[PDB]
Amino acid sequence: YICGDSTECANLLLQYGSFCTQLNRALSGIAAEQDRNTREVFAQVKQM
Question: Which residues of the chain form contacts with a second copy (CB under 8 A)?
Answer: 5, 15-18, 22, 24-26, 28, 35, 45-48
CB distance 10 to 3 below 8 Å: yes
What is the smallest separation between the CB atom of 15 and a second copy, expressed in angstroms? 6
In this complex, which beta carbon is closest to a second copy, that of residue 25 or of residue 37?
Answer: 25
What is the smallest separation between the CB atom of 48 and a second copy, expressed in angstroms? 5
What is the smallest separation between the CB atom of 25 and a second copy, expressed in angstroms? 8
Round to whole Å and give the CA distance between 39 and 43: 5
Round to whole Å and give the CA distance between 33 and 39: 10
